[PDB]
Amino acid sequence: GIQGLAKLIADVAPSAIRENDIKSYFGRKVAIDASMSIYQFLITTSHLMGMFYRTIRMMENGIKPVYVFDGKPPQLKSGEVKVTKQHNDECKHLLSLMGIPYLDAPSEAEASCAALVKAGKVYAAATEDMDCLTFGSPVLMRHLTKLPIQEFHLSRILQELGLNQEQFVDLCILLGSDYCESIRGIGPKRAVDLIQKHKSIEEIVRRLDPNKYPVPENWLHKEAHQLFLEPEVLDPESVELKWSEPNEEELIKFMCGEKQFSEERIRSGVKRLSKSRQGSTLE
């Protein structure tokens, strides 16, 4: 998470956010940040029927989802609802039975998501996690999750604010990332100006007096910067995405044989999923 990036873009780079209806993304592959999507659904097997029904709704609306699951968290995190290892396990299990593709990301899903968008194997990466942009994703989608879908274009953010990726990462770090602390008393809108004018954090600290503006003690901003820039990702060229026919009788055995769901209610969910797979990927 980047503390307050969404509000920043809307204010000083609005030309990057284009608000669209779920219907205009017909026949479109999107990479779905599974951890962030489960976070949404947890608002109890709530995570599983969230993913069951929402994926059907996406598939009926033309969208072809591909979920990407978090792996091992990177060393640096100690600078800053709870998505567990079972939440992930059960969801993966479910998607497997629906014929939806999932991907086990080496580290953080929104980096691997971004990578699919870079390599151009999806249209966009669906997530509210704003640091997916910082991971270099050309297009981010918000609220795919009543509420409009906000499309973010990274080339426009960089174009308006007049910064390359590297500088942009440092802006994000100054806004407040998951990896390190920011410079206290530096507002987000003042952070922009200092990035535009002085380009990088190491420099900004130089033109800042140690008394008035102290940084974190042994501040790992450089390490954060390395992570956002060179993150551990999967190779999308090697990775293959396929949408299979759902295994219905096995899907019952799981949601109803293990997870106390309504059999005929799942039955119809699977039949809509199957029907839309014939609309989306008849092939």
- The stretch among 127-135, 158-166, 184-192, 236-244 that binds ligand R3Z (CB under 6 A) is 127-135
89 is in an annotated binding site: no
Using the minimum distance from each CB to ligand R3Z, give the nearer residue, 92 or 199.
92
The secondary structure of residue 22, as a DSSP letter, is G
64-69 vs 149-153, strand pairing mode = unpaired
The token pair that represents 77 in the structure block: 């995190």
Tell me: does residue 90 bind ligand R3Z (CB under 6 A).
no
Tell me: does residue 178 bind ligand R3Z (CB under 6 A).
yes
Give the total residue count for the chain.
283
The secondary structure of residue 252, as a DSSP letter, is H
Residue pair 106/233 in contact by the 8 Å Cβ criterion: yes
The contact mask relative to Mg ion for 227-256 (x = CB under 5 A, - = no) is ------------------------------
- Among 108, 123, 168, 276, indicate the residue that binds ligand R3Z (CB under 6 A): 108
- Among 110, 112, 201, 255, indicate the residue that binds ligand R3Z (CB under 6 A): 110
Q: Which does 280 bind (CB under 5 to 8 A by kind): ligand R3Z, Mg ion, none?
A: none
Tell me: does residue 128 bind Mg ion (CB under 5 A).
no
Per-residue burial over 175-205, b = 16 or more CB atoms within 10 Å of its CB, e = otherwise: bbbbbbbbbeebebeebbebbeebebbeebb
Residue pair 196/223 in contact by the 8 Å Cβ criterion: no
Using the minimum distance from each CB to ligand R3Z, give the nearer residue, 93 or 143.
143
- Report how far residue 54's alpha carbon sits from residue 48's, in angstroms, rounded to the nearest whole number: 10
Tell me: does residue 170 bind Mg ion (CB under 5 A).
no
Residue pair 68/282 in contact by the 8 Å Cβ criterion: no
Residue nearest to ligand R3Z as judged by C-beta position: 1
Segment 30 to 69, residues that bind ligand R3Z, using CB under 6 A? 35-36, 39
Compute CA distances 8 → 127, 172, 238, whole Å. 17, 10, 36
Tell me: does residue 79 bind ligand R3Z (CB under 6 A).
no
70 is in an annotated binding site: yes
- Report how far residue 146's alpha carbon sits from residue 277's, in angstroms, rounded to the nearest whole number: 24
Segment 59 to 118, residues that bind Mg ion, using CB under 5 A? 108-110
Residue pair 55/94 in contact by the 8 Å Cβ criterion: no
Using the minimum distance from each CB to ligand R3Z, give the nearer residue, 95 or 273.
95
- Report how far residue 96's alpha carbon sits from residue 102's, in angstroms, rounded to the nearest whole number: 7
CA atoms within 13 A on the CB side of 174: 27
33 is in an annotated binding site: yes
Using the minimum distance from each CB to ligand R3Z, give the nearer residue, 180 or 270.
180
**Which spans of this chain sit near ligand R3Z (rule: CB under 6 A)?**
1, 35-36, 39, 70, 83, 108, 110, 128-129, 131, 178
Where is the binding site, in residues? 33, 54, 70, 108, 110, 129, 131, 176, 178
Q: Which residues bind Mg ion (CB under 5 A)?
A: 35, 108-110, 129, 131
Residues at the annotated binding site for DNA?
A: 54, 108, 176, 178
